[PDB]
């Protein structure tokens, strides 16, 4: 009974240690056959276009176009102001701004106070 | 004195001549690498002369040849500091580069772009010389970034390998993290001391505060692959072996230690920064040596050895013995470059095989490389009266005989034991035993370039330590009297490490199989620092970028706030105004309401 | 292992691949374009060695020495040398000399 | 390292503190102590550009070593005697510091014995 | 290291002859391990590992399982190493 | 050159792959040849012990437990062949690989530097251009009505016909282009 | 100044009356000559600006920008030749005339002595840019991008116009000399706070400020190559020049009012560089990089210190050159593969080595490798910020690290790895393209030798 | 040709060569070879070029700017006088910058020349630069990017009012 | 063009159409949760780094280990082989974190202890002449230093 | 036995 391997988000569970790889059913094999069929159809089309002696140019992959559009264009039309969206936006948008304002303002005020008190060393600070 | 400046400047300027001629036809011809090697050799021969002058009379100089620009009260000029450190490191670096290029001619013969490789080598050498011979922080930063960029290019020499690109990007990332502290140092010196010249910085900063020195510490940690920024150096072995041996073994990696050494007069004043350097060096020595003990790739083992030696140099700086650290840099260049050349010879002989497990019984198969590696390992482990003895033994003796963090001293001694251990590992697994390489035997070291290149560094490892140590002026008060065990500690610990490593390696022969211990896993997985540190922060930063910055702010919320809401409001008002009803009865009533309201409000 | 159709396909591709590889071989002749600088036998042993030595060190050293003469004179403080270590002993001009009077004990 | 064992594992009061050393005055005991005479002069040091850490009570031997090194060049093996002399002076200085440490140890023990005498 | 076709064949046959379970006399280029010889599946795995160790290049398992003949190993090695003679 | 994968791995194939991985990791642990041979014969005996289990559920559970043992006992740094994925030399010469189509963009002077090879290349281009139509027809004919259910491609049925979709496999760049 | 203006005007009749074959050639020759003429302006008296006439003056700030514009026009012509080949002669001449009008307006903006004339021409620059984007863009989003750009700029500018007129009514003149010499301090009042906002916001929109930068990615991605070149190189720097000129009026209130914009820029540079790390479009990546560098320039201007201003001018010029070259490099690959997706084209170094070298040098300048003028400006800005507050160094260094990461990431993805097999339309790089990249690079490396030219008046 | 008063250099004390070994000194022969091969041809070339320059000697002159009324005496909105005073103040700013540069150059040269005794033997230059830096900071620092003579005058007046308040 | 990604599917017909659009099995297809993030129709592909995918298989894009037409992971750029990797580790992630963090913590703790108990030698402080080089260390010559006296032992 | 090396056009 060797210690088991805890999968995580950055350490995925190996297929060898997959509890489902050893529990197979006829429907699972059917699904695997269907997926292989899909991949085979796509590979056939790609290779037909790729080995064509007449083709000159890129083989436009619809998947790549969809990926780009979803990453860039489709975001806003499929956005809805929701409590999670609103709260996360508020936090990660303005909170850092106020945090840096606090930090820098406190630092600047401390420096100005020291300067007014004449309690800061700028003996050779002649290039600002 | 008059010849000194001319010779020193010519030594650097000659190196640039092959770069200029790279535009000429020589680049196309096969003669370019040989011309580059001869240029480096002539540069070394010339650099010998100012070294002799300094040995004779200590003729140190600063040359401000060109006035780049004057910014109000700050004058920036191209100034070279030809002091002891520069005048000694230039010949050492040139000699090592000469040997490395001669080896590379043999090692990189098959490579189609050998000329590009040699040109990149000369570019790195020029950048490193700029770094060493710099009197302004800006010139030193020029050298710093040039060395970084050249390392980036050379590591990813085989652009096809995704792993090479990853290693180059990782090196750039860690070195830039160090450059953050470097920029902090530059800014602090400019704001407070009103200069970037080392001379004025030294003059004004009688008791240097903590912040600029901590920034210098960070930059040194980045370049010298200290702990927290260490993983880039072992990953750098993805590049061609000459590149490793030259930059990421003996010359580039010492940049951080050299930067700290250059600022030694300021380093003396602040005690806290000395303590941090000591602790970081001890951590690096221990961790990198422990990682090396269980590594199965020869290049990785030697790279971790380089990191441990750099940590030892950082410790020496912490013990407030800068000149000894410079001496250790000088000796390490020789013996570590030689060890890496031997590794490259083994790899080329065995058809690109780097795993020690697939290498065996090479003691007689490769006699010359075996002799060179044995001598290099003995020098590395501090065998008396070798190059290592003049540096490492003094390092340990000074560490013991000084006010020191206890754990730092203990870790340094343990690290010396582990250095002996991994030297035993490489020798035992590779040269000793029975052959384990694939059947076809292609071993052949009978190449004049390889033989002569290793010969020069062998002679250097044997005698340079004595020669340099005798010639250099005394710069530290020696630890004359010390307890006998204190004197012999280095040898005792080295021999104990040798014995334990030899016994454990012998135990491998026994027909017993045991599943790995947790400590073995920790050492082999490099302390898990790569596994988690290259995944968790990278994942979080990239995911945060895409999810918040790219989407939730830019494409969603800022757009919703300023553009979209205003557009929507104007659209709604347009729909209201253009009611599209147009009934005289309806809007004429509005006229009545308007008349009444106007009469009331405006009298 | 393979199905007979698989075996046949692999064999066909093997034959065609070997044909391609053998067609990648060049002829006995590598045509080249058709005396720019005369070079009979020019002693590459030493003469070319000396030419390289001159062009790469002697010319640069002369140029740099001239630039040194100009730059040193053009601006003050351009070249500053560490004051030579005057160990108690004769000087060139001051001719100053002093002895610590070995006010110590010799035995070792 | 045994002194460290006494300092930490044993009673700390008996063992001297390196930073605090020397707590007791020079006049205590040691009825007549001569000033550590400096063989070399301050100007000599400044002229020889000796490092401040090397500007110690044995800087004269180092001055002679530097002069012999400059004169002996190219030969770099001709200063072995001068090197030995300077090394021995440094050894004696170290021994004197060791004697100071032992003196502090014994003085602290004597103070503890006075405190015992009270009880 | 030209690594000609005949050299590959000789080395594969050499490894197979050094295999104790295979009797050297009946070993032939077309001798199927499964049918003509008495080797089982695990013996196929072992001989594939021996071949890949001899030539220093790793044969993928999907391709490795389908060899089943010394000549197939030879031609597969030739294809991988671009041997055309 | 890789064969078209199957929808699933048969139990026999999975056992074979586990055996190969276990032997390789044992070799990584057992550096010396003799110790490796001893423990490899031991492992072969271990496989032979349950080689003939009749209950498929029992064999499957044995496979699962053995895989767990392999994961615990896997070498942290297993040996990788230099050109194998994850190896030191994997994809090293990839940048040197240059596709054949780059040739058509050569300047006529460069193409005149090597006439004969380009004549041979023109012959190959003619061959491919002629064979494409027949290849497409064959692929249509042999393809099932639903669509290609496997990545496997048929061989040439008749003489004078090239294998369907042969160009890139045949004209793939040399492993060591230089 | 008419030595530059009048030939630039004459470029229009020459282009219109030139033969259909010779339009590009004549335009390029005479634009290069105009730039050679403009090179004379670099000679600036240290104490005083070159006051050519009542309407026009030049200083060490305006001269580098004018030289940049005059140099940029021929480069835009070379870049835009390729994709406008199919266009009819009248359309090509119209495009060239839009470019020439843009150069003329930009020159007059940088040389104008009166703030109202500066505003008139600075807003006039929108019309040619808008026409270029909305007429010769290659995607359906060009109309939306043009609307965004125009309306952002106008919403910023109109309050500036009101404020400038109010200043004319109060002080009595909008001439920059008189304003500088009289320059009575402002008081901390809500009216003066809103005058400060009105003066600053137009330029803060022009210099892409975090939260006001949305127009820039759309415009740069959707515009043709020449339009992207002007937008990156000069149109953003219009904001920097305006802010530097206008900061004289608002002396004391700047200290109070800078903190919102200072924090916005300081955080936004990190945010925009992090966006650059995850962008899927090369043009978009370059645009966000421009946003980050301009945010640095905004910080330098707001700090209002001599070193900050010198670094701001240096960064403006260096970034203009680097961004223009990067857009040209991306446009070449776009013409070859007809897509802007970074992943689509890979391993181009094997196919196009000299272009790979150009990419390497462009990225190295982008990540501020010393002694590039980019690093000179950035380092001066960093030192000024450090004097402003030692804590700024954390953000500045983080931004530098991320800039290096995204620059080398773009270089690695586009120019390294295995070549995309199916793409077969990659062809040997034309001498025009390599010439364009060289014309971008060589001036940038040369300016390092004599940096006083681009260090601004405060040098 | 630089004035020694402007750029002070301590008198040079070079120890005389006092060999104590029979072995020949390589530095001496190498320096003689360098002399013969390089220094003599270079000296000859400079002799030729100096002869040519002396053949056609022409002089350039250092401009003198007469002092002009300061902003202190310039009237309000008097743009002519304000202009003259402002340009004069800018020239004075440049001259003060150059003076600071000269003092800093002395400081750097003294640090290098003294060697390991820099901390003690350069104290006078350190004090000089201390005074010059304090004066320059008080006169010109914090004026801002848009520095003007009026703003410097305002800074001076603020300082003097603070001094009177300190005098109480 | 229906090829472009659409909104979040809400009816089974919408889900089937989306699955066919993304060339995925209907049962396998699983759109991101419609929480307003903007993913919409795009499928939640497994978070497997491209390293994990079998190298040996012939990929349409070998360097990316991706086939043409295959749905592309939303964060594929993040999970490229040159960037963030999720391949299984020999040791558990939590255990790796435990070991590394514990090692570093113990290291720093022991260094702090060494600070508490610093090693040294049983010697007295080094004595320097001329009031510990008061002048040589930058001491003001005009001011009079305390006359440090070192007596012989 | 020289084998042809495929490379992009260099004349341009």
The DSSP annotation for I76-126 comes to TTTTSTTS---PPPSS-HHHHHHHHHHHHHHHHHHHHHHHHS-B--S-PPP
Handedness of CA A99, A105, A108, A113 (dihedral sign): negative
The Cα angle at residue G160 between residues G156 and G162, in degrees rounded to 5: 125
DSSP-assigned letter for residue B475: -
Q: d(Cα B240, Cα B120) in Å, to the nearest integer?
A: 12
Cβ separation H116–D51 shorter than 8 A: yes
Q: d(Cα G321, Cα G444) in Å, to the nearest integer?
A: 7
**A contacts of G307 (beta carbons < 8 Å):** 127-128
The whole-angstrom distance between F94's CA and the closest CA on chain G is 6
In this structure, are residues H43 and C65 in contact, taking their beta carbons and an 8 Å threshold?
A: no
Question: Residue C95: left if φ>0, alpha if ψ -120 to 50, beta else—which one?
Answer: left
User: CB-based contact (8 Å) between H11 and chain D?
Assistant: no
| Orientation angle between helical segments G282-303 and G306-337, nearest 10 degrees | 170
Question: Residue B435: left if φ>0, alpha if ψ -120 to 50, beta else—which one?
Answer: beta
The whole-angstrom distance between I127's CA and the closest CA on chain H is 19
User: CB-based contact (8 Å) between A85 and chain B?
Assistant: yes
The whole-angstrom distance between F66's CA and the closest CA on chain J is 49
The whole-angstrom distance between H156's CA and the closest CA on chain G is 17
In this structure, are residues B349 and B443 in contact, taking their beta carbons and an 8 Å threshold?
A: yes
The residue among G132, G130, G128, G288 whose CA lies nearest residue G225 is G132
User: Known catalytic residue: E40?
Assistant: yes
The residue among C107, B476, B485, B387 whose CA lies nearest residue D84 is C107
DSSP-assigned letter for residue C91: B
The kind and range of the H/E element at D116 are: helix D80-118
Across the strands, what pairs with D22?
Answer: none
Q: Which residues 8-27 in chain E show a CB within 8 A of chain B? A: 11
The Cα angle at residue B489 between residues B487 and B491, in degrees rounded to 5: 100
What are all long-range contacts of C41-44, with beta carbons under 8 Å and residues at least 24 apart?
Answer: none
Q: Which residues contact G138 (CB under 8 A, 6 or more apart)?
A: G83, G224
- State both tokens at B185: 């140092």
Sheet of strand B74-82: strand arrangement: B74-82, B61-71, C79-81
Interface residue of D72, D73, D77 to substitute, partner H, most H CBs within 10 Å? D73
Q: d(Cα G296, Cα G427) in Å, to the nearest integer?
A: 38
What are the Cα distances from residue G354, in Å, to B151, B325, G350? Answer: 21, 43, 10
Nearest CA in chain H to G301: H145
The kind and range of the H/E element at B244 are: helix B241-245
b/e F115-126 (16+ beta carbons within 10 angstroms → b):
eebbebbeebee
- State both tokens at B223: 């370049």
The kind and range of the H/E element at G75 are: helix G62-81
Q: d(Cα E48, Cα E26) in Å, to the nearest integer?
A: 19
In this structure, are residues G125 and G102 in contact, taking their beta carbons and an 8 Å threshold?
A: yes
The Cα angle at residue H127 between residues H121 and H128, in degrees rounded to 5: 110
User: How many angstroms is the resolution?
Assistant: 3.5
Cβ separation C77–H105 shorter than 8 A: yes
The residue among A49, I58, J10 whose CA lies nearest residue F102 is J10
Q: d(Cα B175, Cα G361) in Å, to the nearest integer?
A: 19
Given E10, E23, E36, E40, the catalytic residue: E40
In this structure, are residues B497 and B424 in contact, taking their beta carbons and an 8 Å threshold?
A: yes
Q: Which residues contact H63 (CB under 8 A, 6 or more apart)?
A: none
| Orientation angle between helical segments G115-124 and G236-246, nearest 10 degrees | 170
Cβ separation F16–E49 shorter than 8 A: no
What are the Cα distances from residue G17, in Å, to G7, G26, G96? Answer: 15, 11, 12
The residue among B74, G316, G251 whose CA lies nearest residue H145 is G251
Cβ separation A70–I92 shorter than 8 A: no
Q: Which residues 395-414 in chain G show a CB within 8 A of chain F? A: none
C29 assigned to a ligand binding site:
no
Touching, G vs E (3+ Cβ pairs under 8 A): no
- State both tokens at B253: 């990696």
Q: How many CB atoms lie within 10 A of CB B458?
A: 22
**H contacts of B194 (beta carbons < 8 Å):** 104, 133
Q: d(Cα B464, Cα B387) in Å, to the nearest integer?
A: 7
- State both tokens at B484: 């006998």
**E contacts of B442 (beta carbons < 8 Å):** 1
Residue by residue, DSSP assigns E43-83 as HHHHHHHHHHHHHS-PPPHHHHTT--SHHHHHHHHHHHHT-
Nearest CA in chain J to F99: J6
Cα G264 from chain centroid? 20
Q: d(Cα B43, Cα B101) in Å, to the nearest integer?
A: 14
On the 0-12 / 13-18 / 19+ scale of CB atoms within 10 A, C14 is: middle
Cβ separation G280–A72 shorter than 8 A: yes
Cβ separation F1–E63 shorter than 8 A: yes
Tally of CA atoms within 13 A in the half-sphere of B62 that contains its CB: 27
| Orientation angle between helical segments E5-17 and E70-81, nearest 10 degrees | 140
The residue among B548, A107, B141 whose CA lies nearest residue G270 is B548
Handedness of CA G275, G278, G279, G285 (dihedral sign): positive
Q: d(Cα E35, Cα B527) in Å, to the nearest integer?
A: 51
How long a stretch of residues is chain E? Answer: 85
Handedness of CA G174, G177, G182, G184 (dihedral sign): positive
The Cα angle at residue G117 between residues G112 and G122, in degrees rounded to 5: 90
Q: Which residues contact G226 (CB under 8 A, 6 or more apart)?
A: G76, G77, G79, G80, G95, G99, G132
Q: d(Cα E75, Cα E66) in Å, to the nearest integer?
A: 13
The whole-angstrom distance between D53's CA and the closest CA on chain I is 9
Q: d(Cα D86, Cα D57) in Å, to the nearest integer?
A: 11
The kind and range of the H/E element at B67 are: strand B61-71
Q: Which residues contact A72 (CB under 8 A, 6 or more apart)?
A: B555, G280, G281, G284
**What percent of the residues of chain E are helix, what percent strand, and what percent coil, each to the nearest 5?**
50, 0, 50
Residue by residue, DSSP assigns B285-344 as HHHHHHHHHT--BHHHHHHHHHHHHHHHHHHHHHTT-HHHHHHHHHHHHHHHHHHHHHHH
Cα B108 from chain centroid? 23
User: CB-based contact (8 Å) between A43 and chain G?
Assistant: no
**C contacts of H112 (beta carbons < 8 Å):** 80-82
Q: d(Cα C56, Cα C43) in Å, to the nearest integer?
A: 18
Cα B49 from chain centroid? 29
Q: d(Cα G375, Cα G352) in Å, to the nearest integer?
A: 28
Q: d(Cα A104, Cα G255) in Å, to the nearest integer?
A: 13
DSSP H helix total and E strand total for chain D? 4, 0
| Orientation angle between helical segments F56-73 and F11-29, nearest 10 degrees | 30
Q: Which residues contact I10 (CB under 8 A, 6 or more apart)?
A: none
Q: How was this structure determined?
A: cryo-EM
Question: Residue G338: left if φ>0, alpha if ψ -120 to 50, beta else—which one?
Answer: left
Q: d(Cα B82, Cα G72) in Å, to the nearest integer?
A: 44
The answer to whether the bond into B220 is cis (omega within 30° of 0) is: no
**I contacts of D18 (beta carbons < 8 Å):** 120, 125
On the 0-12 / 13-18 / 19+ scale of CB atoms within 10 A, G231 is: buried
Helix (H, G, I), strand (E, B) or coil at B497: helix
């Amino acid at each position: 009974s060797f210690p088991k391997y805890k999968p995580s988000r950055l350490a995925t569970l190996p297929a060898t240690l997959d509890p489902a790889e050893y529990d197979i059913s006829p429907e699972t094999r059917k699904a695997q056959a269907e997926r292989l069929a899909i991949r085979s159809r796509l590979k056939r089309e790609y290779l037909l276009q790729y080995n064509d002696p007449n083709r000159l140019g890129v083989i436009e992959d619809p998947a790549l176009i969809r990926w780009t559009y979803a990453r860039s264009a489709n975001i806003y039309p499929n956005f809805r102001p929701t409590p999670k969206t609103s709260l996360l936006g508020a936090l990660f948008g303005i909170g850092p701004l106020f945090f840096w304002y606090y930090v820098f303002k406190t630092d600047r005020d401390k420096k100005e106070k020291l300067i007014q008190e004449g309690k800061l060393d700028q003996t050779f600070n002649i290039s600002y | 004195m008059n010849p000194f400046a001319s010779l020193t400047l010519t030594t650097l300027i000659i190196l640039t001549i092959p770069i200029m001629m790279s535009n000429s036809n020589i680049y196309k011809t096969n003669l370019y690498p040989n011309y580059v090697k001869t240029t480096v050799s002539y540069a070394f021969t010339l650099s010998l002369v100012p070294l002799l002058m300094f040995m004779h009379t200590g003729q140190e100089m600063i040359i401000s040849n060109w006035h780049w620009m004057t910014l109000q009260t700050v004058e920036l000029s191209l100034s070279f500091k030809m002091d002891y450190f520069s005048v000694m490191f230039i010949p050492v670096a040139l000699f090592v580069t000469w040997s490395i290029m001669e080896f590379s001619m043999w090692y990189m013969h098959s490579d189609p772009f050998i000329n590009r490789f040699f040109k990149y080598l000369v570019l790195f050498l020029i950048t490193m010389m700029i770094l060493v011979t710099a009197n302004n922080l800006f010139q030193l930063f020029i050298g710093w970034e040039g060395v970084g960029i050249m390392s980036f290019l050379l590591i990813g020499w085989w652009h096809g390998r995704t792993d090479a690109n990853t290693a180059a990007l990782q090196a750039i990332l860690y070195n830039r993290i160090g450059d953050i502290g470097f920029v902090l140092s530059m800014a602090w010196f400019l704001t407070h001391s009103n200069a970037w010249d080392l001379q004025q910085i030294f003059m004004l900063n009688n008791e240097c505060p903590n912040m600029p020195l901590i920034g210098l510490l960070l930059a040194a940690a980045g370049k010298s692959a200290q702990f927290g920024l260490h993983p880039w150096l072992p990953s750098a072995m993805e590049g061609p072996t000459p590149v490793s041996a030259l930059l990421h073994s003996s010359t580039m990696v010492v940049a951080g230690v050299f930067l700290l050494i250059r600022f030694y007069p300021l380093m003396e004043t602040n005690k806290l920064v000395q303590t941090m350097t000591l602790c970081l060096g001890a951590i690096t020595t221990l961790f990198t040596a422990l990682c090396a003990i269980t590594q199965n790739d020869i290049k990785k083992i030697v790279a971790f050895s380089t990191s441990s030696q750099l940590g030892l140099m950082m410790v020496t700086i912490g013990i407030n013995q800068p000149h000894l650290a410079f001496l250790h840099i000088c000796m390490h260049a020789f013996f570590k470059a030689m060890l890496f050349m031997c590794s490259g010879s083994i790899i080329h002989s065995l058809n690109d095989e780097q795993d020690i497990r697939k290498m065996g019984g090479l003691y007689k198969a490769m006699p010359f490389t075996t002799t060179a590696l044995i001598i290099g390992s003995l020098a590395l482990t501090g065998m008396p009266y070798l190059t290592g003895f003049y540096s490492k033994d003094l390092i340990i003796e000074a560490v013991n005989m000084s006010y020191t963090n206890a754990w730092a001293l203990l870790m340094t001694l343990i690290a010396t034991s582990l250095t002996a251990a991994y030297s035993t590992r490489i020798i035992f697994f590779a040269f000793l035993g029975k052959p384990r390489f694939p059947p076809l035997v292609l071993i052949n070291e009978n190449n004049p370039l390889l033989i002569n290149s290793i010969k020069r560094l062998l002679i250097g490892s044997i005698f340079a330590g004595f020669i340099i140590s005798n010639n250099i002026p005394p710069m530290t008060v020696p630890n004359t009297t010390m307890p006998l065990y204190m004197k012999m500690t280095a040898l005792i610990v080295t021999i104990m490490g040798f014995m334990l490593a030899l016994e454990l390696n012998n135990t491998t022969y026994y027909l017993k199989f045991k599943y790995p211990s947790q400590t073995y896993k920790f050492s082999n997985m490099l302390g898990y620092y790569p596994s988690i540190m290259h995944r968790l922060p990278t994942y979080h930063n990239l995911s945060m970028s895409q999810k918040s910055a790219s989407s939730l702010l830019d494409l969603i919320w800022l757009e919703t706030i300023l553009p979209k809401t205003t557009s929507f409001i104007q659209m709604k008002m347009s729909i209201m105004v253009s009611n599209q009803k147009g009934l005289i009865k309806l809007y004429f009533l509005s006229f009545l309401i308007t008349i009444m309201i106007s009469m009331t409000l405006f009298n | 292992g393979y199905t007979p159709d698989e075996k046949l396909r692999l064999q066909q591709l093997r034959e065609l691949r070997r044909r391609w590889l053998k067609d990648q071989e060049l002829s006995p002749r590598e045509p080249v374009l058709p005396l720019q600088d005369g070079a009979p036998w020019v002693i590459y042993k030493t003469y070319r060695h000396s030419i390289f030595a001159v062009t790469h060190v002697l010319i640069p050293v002369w140029i740099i020495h001239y630039y040194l003469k100009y730059h040193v004179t053009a601006k003050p403080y351009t070249v500053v040398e560490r004051k030579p270590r005057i160990f108690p002993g004769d000087t060139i001009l001051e001719t100053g000399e002093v002895i610590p009077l070995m006010k110590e004990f010799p035995d070792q | 390292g045994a002194h460290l064992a006494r300092r930490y594992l044993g009673d700390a009061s008996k063992e001297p503190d390196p930073l605090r050393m020397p707590t007791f005055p020079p006049d205590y005991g040691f009825p007549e102590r001569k000033e550590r005479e400096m063989v070399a002069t301050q100007q000599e040091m400044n002229d020889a550009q000796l490092m401040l850490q090397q500007r110690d009570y044995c800087a004269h031997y180092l001055i002679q070593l530097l002069k012999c090194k400059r004169d002996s060049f190219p030969n770099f093996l001709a200063c072995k005697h001068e090197q030995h002399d300077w090394d021995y002076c440094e050894h004696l200085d170290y021994v004197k510091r060791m004697k100071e440490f032992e003196r502090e140890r014994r003085l602290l023990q004597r103070k503890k014995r006075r405190e015992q005498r009270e009880a | 290291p030209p690594l000609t076709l005949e050299a590959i064949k000789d080395r594969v046959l050499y490894v197979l002859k050094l295999y104790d379970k295979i009797d050297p006399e009946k070993l032939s280029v077309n001798s199927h391990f499964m049918k003509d010889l008495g080797l089982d599946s695990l013996d196929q795995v072992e001989i594939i590992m021996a071949m890949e160790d001899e030539f220093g290049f790793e044969i993928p398992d999907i391709d490795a399982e389908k060899l089943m003949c010394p000549q197939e190993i030879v031609d597969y090695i030739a294809d991988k190493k671009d041997v055309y003679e | 050159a890789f064969s078209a994968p199957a929808a699933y791995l048969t139990h026999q194939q999975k056992v074979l792959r586990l055996y190969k991985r276990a032997l390789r990791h044992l070799e990584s642990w057992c550096v010396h040849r003799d110790k490796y041979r001893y423990f490899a014969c031991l492992m072969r005996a271990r496989f032979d012990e349950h080689k003939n289990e009749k209950d498929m559920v029992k064999a499957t559970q044995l496979l699962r437990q053995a895989e767990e043992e392999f994961w615990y006992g896997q070498h942290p740094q297993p040996y990788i062949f230099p050109e194998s994925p994850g190896g030191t030399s994997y994809e090293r010469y990839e940048c040197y690989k240059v596709p054949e189509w780059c040739l058509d963009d050569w300047h006529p002077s460069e193409k005149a530097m090597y006439p004969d090879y380009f004549a041979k290349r023109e012959q190959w281009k003619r061959l491919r251009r002629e064979s494409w139509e027949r290849e497409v027809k064959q692929l249509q004919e042999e393809t099932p009505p639903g669509g290609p259910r496997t990545e496997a491609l048929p061989p040439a049925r008749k003489e004078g016909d090239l294998p369907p979709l042969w160009w890139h496999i045949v004209t793939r760049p040399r492993e060591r282009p230089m | 100044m008419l030595k530059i203006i009048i030939p630039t005007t004459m470029l229009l009749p020459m282009t219109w009356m030139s033969k259909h074959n010779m339009i590009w050639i004549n335009a390029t020759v005479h634009s290069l000559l105009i730039s050679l003429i403009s090179l004379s302006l670099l000679n600036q008296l240290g104490e005083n600006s070159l006051n050519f006439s009542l309407t026009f003056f030049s200083d060490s700030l305006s001269a580098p920008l004018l030289v940049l514009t005059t140099w940029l026009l021929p480069l835009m012509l070379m870049a835009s030749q390729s994709h406008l080949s199919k266009e009819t002669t009248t359309r090509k001449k119209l495009y060239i005339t839009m470019l020439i009008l843009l150069q003329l307006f930009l020159i007059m903006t940088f040389t104008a002595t009166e703030l109202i004339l500066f505003y008139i021409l600075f807003e006039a620059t929108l019309v040619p840019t808008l026409i270029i984007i909305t007429r010769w863009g290659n995607q359906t989003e060009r109309l939306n991008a043009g609307l965004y750009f125009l309306f952002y700029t106008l919403a910023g500018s109109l309050p500036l116009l009101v404020a400038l007129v109010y200043i004319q009514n109060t002080t009595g003149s909008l001439n920059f000399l008189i304003i500088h010499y009289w320059s009575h301090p402002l008081s901390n009042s809500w009216s003066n706070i809103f005058m400060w906002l009105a003066c600053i916001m137009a330029f803060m929109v022009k210099m892409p400020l975090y939260g006001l930068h949305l127009w820039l990615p759309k415009a740069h991605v959707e515009a043709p190559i020449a339009g992207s070149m002007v937008l990156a190189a000069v149109l953003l720097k219009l904001g920097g020049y305006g802010m530097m000129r206008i900061t004289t009026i608002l002396n004391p209130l700047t200290n109070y009012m800078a903190y919102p914009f200072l924090m916005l820029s300081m955080w936004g540079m990190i945010m925009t560089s992090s966006i650059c790390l995850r962008q899927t479009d090369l043009k978009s990546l370059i645009a966000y990089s421009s946003v980050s560098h301009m945010a640095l320039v905004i910080v330098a201007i707001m700090i209002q210190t001599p070193w900050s201003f010198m670094g701001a001018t240096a960064l403006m010029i260096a970034h203009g050159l680097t961004s223009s070259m990067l857009f040209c490099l991306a446009n070449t690959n776009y013409e070859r593969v007809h897509s802007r997706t970074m992943i689509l084209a890979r391993g181009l170094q094997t196919l196009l080595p000299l272009m790979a070298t150009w990419w390497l040098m462009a990225s190295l300048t982008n990540l501020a490798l010393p002694p590039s003028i980019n690093l000179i400006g950035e380092l001066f800005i960093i030192t000024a910020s450090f004097s402003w507050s030692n804590i700024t160094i954390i953000l500045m260094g983080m931004n530098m690290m991320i800039t290096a990461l995204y620059s080398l990431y773009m270089l690695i993805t586009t120019q390294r790895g295995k070549y995309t097999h199916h793409i077969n339309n990659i062809k040997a790089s034309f001498t025009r393209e390599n010439a364009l990249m060289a014309l971008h690079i060589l001036p940038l490396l040369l300016l390092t030798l004599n940096p006083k030219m681009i260090l601004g008046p405060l040098y | 040709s630089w004035d020694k008063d402007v750029y002070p250099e301590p008198p040079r004390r070079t120890p005389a060569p006092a060999p104590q070994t029979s072995l020949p000194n390589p530095v001496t022969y190498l320096t003689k070879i360098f002399d013969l091969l390089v220094d003599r041809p270079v000296t000859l070339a400079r002799e030729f070029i100096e002869q040519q320059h002396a053949k056609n000697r022409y002089y350039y002159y250092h401009r003198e700017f007469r002092r002009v009324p300061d902003i202190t005496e310039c009237e309000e909105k008097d743009i002519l006088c304000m202009f003259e005073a402002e340009m004069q103040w800018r020239r004075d700013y440049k001259v003060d910058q150059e003076i600071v540069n000269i003092i800093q150059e002395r400081l750097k040269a003294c640090q290098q020349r003294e060697g390991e005794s820099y901390r003690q033997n350069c104290a006078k230059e350190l004090e000089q630069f201390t005074q010059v830096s304090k004066a320059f900071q008080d006169r010109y620092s914090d004026l801002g990017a848009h520095y003007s003579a009026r703003k410097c005058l305002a800074k001076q007046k603020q300082r003097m009012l603070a001094e009177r308040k300190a005098a109480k | 063009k229906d090829m472009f990604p659409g909104p979040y599917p809400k009816t089974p017909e919408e889900r089937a159409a989306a699955a066919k659009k993304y060339n995925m099995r209907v049962e396998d297809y699983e759109p991101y949760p419609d929480d307003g993030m903007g993913y919409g129709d795009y499928p939640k592909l497994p978070d497997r780094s491209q390293q994990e995918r079998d190298p040996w298989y012939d990929w349409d894009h070998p360097d990316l280990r991706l086939n043409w037409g295959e749905p592309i992971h939303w964060d594929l750029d993040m999970y490229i082989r040159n960037r963030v990797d999720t391949s299984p580790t020999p040791v558990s992630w939590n255990t790796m974190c435990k070991h590394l963090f514990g090692f570093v913590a113990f290291m720093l703790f022991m260094f702090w202890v060494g600070e508490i108990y610093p090693s040294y030698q049983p010697v007295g402080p080094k004595q320097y002449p001329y009031n510990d080089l008061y002048l040589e260390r930058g001491g003001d010559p005009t001011k009079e230093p305390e006359p440090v006296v070192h007596y012989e032992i | 036995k020289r084998l042809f090396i495929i490379k992009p056009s260099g004349f341009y």
